[PDB]
Amino acid sequence: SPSSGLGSITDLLNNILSVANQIIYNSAVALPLQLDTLESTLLTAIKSLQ
Amino acid sequence: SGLGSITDLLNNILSVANQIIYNSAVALPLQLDTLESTLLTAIKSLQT
Amino acid sequence: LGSITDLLNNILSVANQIIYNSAVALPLQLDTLESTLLTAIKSLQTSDKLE
Amino acid sequence: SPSSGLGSITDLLNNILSVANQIIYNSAVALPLQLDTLESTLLTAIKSLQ
């Protein structure tokens, strides 16, 4: 209903898209980076044994 | 169910999306830290 | 109802599944990874006391 | 594009759907694959002292 209905719906959809964009950053960049760092830390501690 | 209920759906989706931010940016990273620490101690108990 | 209502219902549905994956399935895999590794390390100690 | 197509709204819903899907793949498949690859690497590093 002019023009706010389009505007209010458009604004929520815009919020949701920015959050999902952040979630895809967390899952495809941040966490994979955290797991790589964790692997090598532990991998180093284990090789530190022999 | 006019514009209002669609606005409820949107709020429900936004709220759930927020929970997913918590899980992925807070809970999982913290779980990984706790795990890293537990294994680090155990490996270290082999050393000394 | 309806096209937008249908799309939104789908999105929500995928979202609830993402909540399960990230709050239940992944933490379970992390716990099991921890358990499995601790067990490898530990059974190794138990293998020290002999030979 | 004709107004009947809804314009702003329709593209947003498609993007959010596309992203949600990629998030599903990352949490259900990619991260699990990386976790398994991690566990093997560490186990193999342990297997190599034994």
Side-chain angles (χ1 to χ4, degrees), chain B residues 1 19 23 31 38-39 45-46, chain C residues 1 22 27 30-31 38 45:
Chain B
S1 288
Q19 281 165 248
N23 296 347
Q31 175 168 11
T38 293
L39 296 174
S45 74
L46 286 178
Chain C
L1 307 83
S22 73
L30 301 181
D31 288 345
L38 259 11
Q45 287 171 357

Side-chain angles (χ1 to χ4, degrees), chain A residues 12-13 22-23 26 34 48-49, chain B residues 11 17 20 24-25 29 33 47:
Chain A
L12 290 153
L13 289 165
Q22 179 74 59
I23 289 167
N26 291 350
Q34 189 177 356
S48 184
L49 295 157
Chain B
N11 286 327
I20 294 166
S24 67
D33 289 358
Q47 289 287 145

Side-chain angles (χ1 to χ4, degrees), chain A residues 34, chain B residues 28-40, chain C residues 34:
Chain A
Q34 189 177 356
Chain B
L28 288 164
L30 289 179
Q31 175 168 11
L32 289 167
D33 289 358
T34 303
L35 148 61
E36 192 190 17
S37 144
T38 293
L39 296 174
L40 239 19
Chain C
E34 181 180 15

